[PDB]
Amino acid sequence: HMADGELNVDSLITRLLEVRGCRPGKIVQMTEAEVRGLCIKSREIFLSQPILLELEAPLKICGDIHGQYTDLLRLFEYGGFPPEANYLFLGDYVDRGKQSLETICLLLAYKIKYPENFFLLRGNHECASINRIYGFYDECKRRFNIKLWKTFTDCFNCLPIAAIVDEKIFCCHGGLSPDLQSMEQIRRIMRPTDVPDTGLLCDLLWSDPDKDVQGWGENDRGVSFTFGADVVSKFLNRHDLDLICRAHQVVEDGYEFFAKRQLVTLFSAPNYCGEFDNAGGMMSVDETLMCSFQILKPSEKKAKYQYGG
């Protein structure tokens, strides 16, 4: 309805959904001022909401997307385009994939349109430190300039770090931290901010689960650590939580349980990097907390027909 600001999300969201049906990699053209607008408008909404989101079921949580726009569109076509359903993405929207720009813009756009039904957390690829090395920088400078990139940087720096659904499901891109004892440590976190090579915030965006590990172990990623199922239990038993939802790691079926269904990993980028042949995941959480999984098989993975009967 009439009036308001400069950015017309309606115009952008639309143009962005227009390539639905067009060949993948088909570009959604737009003004750097519309992109820069998206950044600043969303950035302002993030800062206006907690760093530790306190959300409420029902909602559909998603894992990494890594610029795989064609697939993200497919995710929404499955769980329903906003505001049809409540969404909570766990990070890693850029790098690797072909369309980080299309992907993030749409996400941010929706964040603006439905700021109370749409949420984005920060993935480890939401740090200039690394998406500079993994393609997002090049995809920006390729279609715009390094400054547009820096504007995204200022935005990512404002993203929330975690979310707690109905007070029972702790969500974050990476995982746990030997520093995380009280949620309050999250809440007292300055923003805008970057991501250190070490620290509580770095752990949340980096750490990983490892059955072969008991307590705290080192991480083959060269940063942060890894945690055993016992640490997961101590955590939950502590804050009285039921589940720890996260992404960060590629999992064959889109999702994967750990520590006896105490923790789950979601990855929503089908056939990631074309290297692996994994499916994409998406967890549905209704008002009861009845969690189910909607899977997204790699596209172009057509199953040879059979007469049927």
Binding site: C22, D179, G199, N237, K302, K304, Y305
Partner: protein, 291 residues
């Protein structure tokens, strides 16, 4: 201080965790609030995975379809075989497991064990009534997929032992399609029961499998050469994808809209991902000099 950083900071970090709530009793401490639950399928399909034979029992005892299967159609048994998890395979069968349940690709647990060489399992299944003549999408039976001598032998001496007509099986599908195609063309009433899953049609099965005769006979019944399945594929998208050359020629000779697009946005040439690619373009150059 530049490298000690990452290493020492993390260390002088784990340290604090020591006195920290690493002491907080590490079990389950099943609070009076296990409010979060997971779908039965997800929970069942997985309980078997780890191997908690025990919990599967309760899950079944409570009411869970033993023949539940993931997106690829794999049952709790298929996976069991794929993991040479002997004990489970038997547990599954002894608890009601459908021993011949096909996956979304026509693969029954016997195909799995066969293709993987888990002979001890192939033996168990075959003895518990497994169907050695089952054919999959590519027209193969466990025997065709057995690429280990010991395996091939067992299956070979099993097909010959039971007197199973192999080709009979590979031909069964096409065979039927012909009958039906004849009945429809003849009477003049198409009675094609679109396949519940893929939303594809007999025109698609004809093209994907390269059943030249059934196709020609199908077109003559005036069946829309440009029908799309739920994925948005054309009877050309298939004949091309799986590379059935002559299947494409037929599709073209009847003015098949070659410019058709995939629901994800691909051409018959696009998802025709396999080899032939250039040939189509030739036929395309002909779908003009005569029209």
């Amino acid at each position: 201080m530049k490298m000690a950083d990452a290493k020492q900071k993390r260390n002088e970090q784990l340290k604090r965790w020591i006195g920290s709530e690493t002491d907080l009793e590490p079990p389950v401490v099943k609070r009076k609030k296990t409010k979060v639950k997971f779908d039965d399928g997800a929970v069942f399909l997985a309980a078997c995975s780890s191997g908690d034979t025990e919990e599967v029992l309760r899950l079944l005892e409570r009411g869970a379809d033993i023949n539940y299967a993931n997106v690829d159609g794999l049952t709790a048994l298929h996976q069991a075989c794929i993991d040479d998890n002997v004990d489970m395979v038997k547990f599954l069968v002894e608890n009601g497991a459908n021993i011949n349940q096909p996956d979304n690709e026509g693969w029954i647990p016997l195909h799995a064990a066969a293709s993987c060489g888990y002979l001890d399992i192939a033996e168990y299944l075959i003895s518990q009534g497994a169907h050695v003549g089952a054919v999959n999408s590519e027209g193969d039976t466990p025997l065709d997929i057995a690429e280990e001598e010991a395996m091939e032998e067992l299956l070979q001496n099993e097909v010959n032992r039971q007197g199973v007509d192999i080709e009979a099986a590979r031909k069964e599908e096409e065979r039927i399609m012909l009958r039906d195609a004849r009945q429809w063309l003849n009477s003049g009433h198409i009675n094609d029961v679109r396949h519940a899953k893929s939303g594809g049609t007999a025109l698609h099965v004809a093209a994907a499998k390269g059943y030249t005769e059934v196709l020609k006979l199908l077109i003559q019944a005036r069946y829309d050469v440009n029908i799309k399945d739920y994925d948005g594929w054309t009877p050309l998208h298939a004949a091309a994808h799986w590379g059935k050359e002559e299947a494409c020629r037929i599709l073209v000779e009847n003015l098949c809209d070659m410019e058709a697009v995939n629901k994800v946005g691909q051409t018959a040439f696009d998802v025709a991902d396999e080899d032939i690619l250039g040939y189509l373009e030739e036929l395309q150059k002909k779908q003009n000099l005569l029209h």
